[PDB]
Structure formats: C-alpha cells, structure tokens
Design a protein around this ligand. Structure first.
Ligand SMILES: CC(=O)N[C@H]1[C@H](O[C@H]2[C@H](O[C@H](C)C(=O)N[C@@H](C)C(=O)N[C@H](CCC(=O)N[C@@H](CCC[C@@H](N)C(=O)O)C(=O)N[C@H](C)C(=O)O)C(=O)O)[C@@H](NC(C)=O)[C@@H]3OC[C@H]2O3)O[C@H](CO)[C@@H](O)[C@@H]1O
Ligand SMILES: [Zn+2]
Length: 169
C-alpha cells in the first residue's frame, strides 16, 4: 500500500507545498502508468481532490518524500490533477524518476477497467505533453510493473495500456 496509510493545478486541489523540487532537463523519454490501489476510484471533483491530498499526505508525512510521488493524477471525474508536474524528478519509479512522466489513475484497476473519461484524460495528457515538448516524440509507454516488482498498475489497466500507442516491451 504505497499511496495511503481539463487540467487542475496543485492549488486547484488544495496541495501542500513540496518540501523541495528538483528538475530534469529535456522531454521525458518514458511515460509510466500507475494505479493508486488505495485510495479507491473517485467520481466527484471534491472527492478526487481529497484523494490527491490523501496520497500527498501519505507520501510527504509517512514516506518522508518531498511531495506526492506522481507527476499527474487522473480522477473518475475525468479531470487531470497536477502532481509534481512535467520535468520534475518524481518518486514513483526508481531509475525512471528523472526521465519520466508518472501518471496515476486513481483507483484499484487490478480487475476492473477504468471508466472511459479516465482513459481519455490519460491519453489527452500524454498527447498534450508531446505537443508542448514535455514528452519525447519517441517516448516509451510502460506500466510500473515493467520496471519494478509490483502489480501496479493492475492487470486489467496494464492489458488496456498494452494496446496504446508507444507501449514498449
Ligand atoms: C502505486 C505506486 O506505484 N506508488 C508509487 C508512488 C511508489 O510507491 N513507487 C515507489 C517509488 C519509490 C521512489 O521512487 N522513491 C524515491 C524517493 C525519493 C525521495 C525524494 N528524493 C523525493 O523526490 O520525494 C527514489 O527511490 N528515488 C531514486 C533516487 C530514483 O529515482 O532512483 C517504488 O516503485 O517502489
Ligand atoms: Zn505504481
């Protein structure tokens, strides 16, 4: 249990300040998909904002990290939540934190498929990142489980992203 004990800004969802921020240069060559597992899927915007605060609190206060570990969160409201954001060194996938966008789809996606507004938000965030130059045009799309011993992002979500553009073995 790693994460619990339109594009919204960190201030939109009530984020605490990061303890510290480290940047990396250049478009990210990797996009790494996660699920939260806990907390659960969130359908209202205020519930998704609370999930982002709860994950941030677990990461900062219990794991002692600088900030929520992920670059971005996706809610069941179909909104994108800024975590550390583009070109900020993450805390979601060791050896890939300084070279990836880590996207968490809030919820447990081991057996259930995220609803379509969540899959669309994640695809749109990546396309946006590519267009604006934050994500390398030859990026590789991975699930967390491809680079670390974990079930993340869940079997069902991992099978879904296996079908997406730039999915890489
Ligand atoms: C769900 C899910 O996958 N949750 C994520 C947040 C998770 O727990 N992933 C950890 C990430 C652990 C992590 O990356 N921690 C940072 C800790 C960073 C602490 C501090 N430097 C910070 O930036 O907050 C780290 O090890 N970084 C090193 C230097 C690396 O990139 O190789 C894992 O895969 O074990
Ligand atoms: Zn993960």
């Amino acid at each position: 249990q790693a994460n619990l004990g339109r594009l919204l800004s960190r201030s939109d969802w009530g984020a605490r300040l990061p303890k510290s921020v480290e940047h990396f240069q250049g478009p990210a060559p990797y996009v790494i998909i996660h699920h939260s597992y806990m907390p659960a899927v969130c359908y209202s915007t205020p519930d998704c904002m609370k999930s982002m605060r709860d994950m941030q609190d677990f990461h900062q206060l219990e794991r002692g990290w600088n900030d929520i570990g992920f670059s971005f969160g996706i809610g069941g409201d179909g909104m994108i939540y800024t975590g550390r954001g583009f070109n900020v060194i993450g805390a979601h996938a060791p050896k890939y934190n300084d070279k990836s966008v880590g996207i968490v789809l809030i919820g447990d996606w081991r057996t259930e498929l995220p609803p379509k507004q969540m899959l669309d938000a994640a695809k749109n965030l990546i396309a946006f990142g590519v267009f604006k130059g934050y994500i390398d045009p030859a990026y590789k799309l991975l699930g967390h489980r491809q680079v670390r011993d974990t079930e993340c992002p869940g079997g069902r979500l991992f099978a879904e992203i296996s079908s997406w553009p730039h999915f890489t073995h």
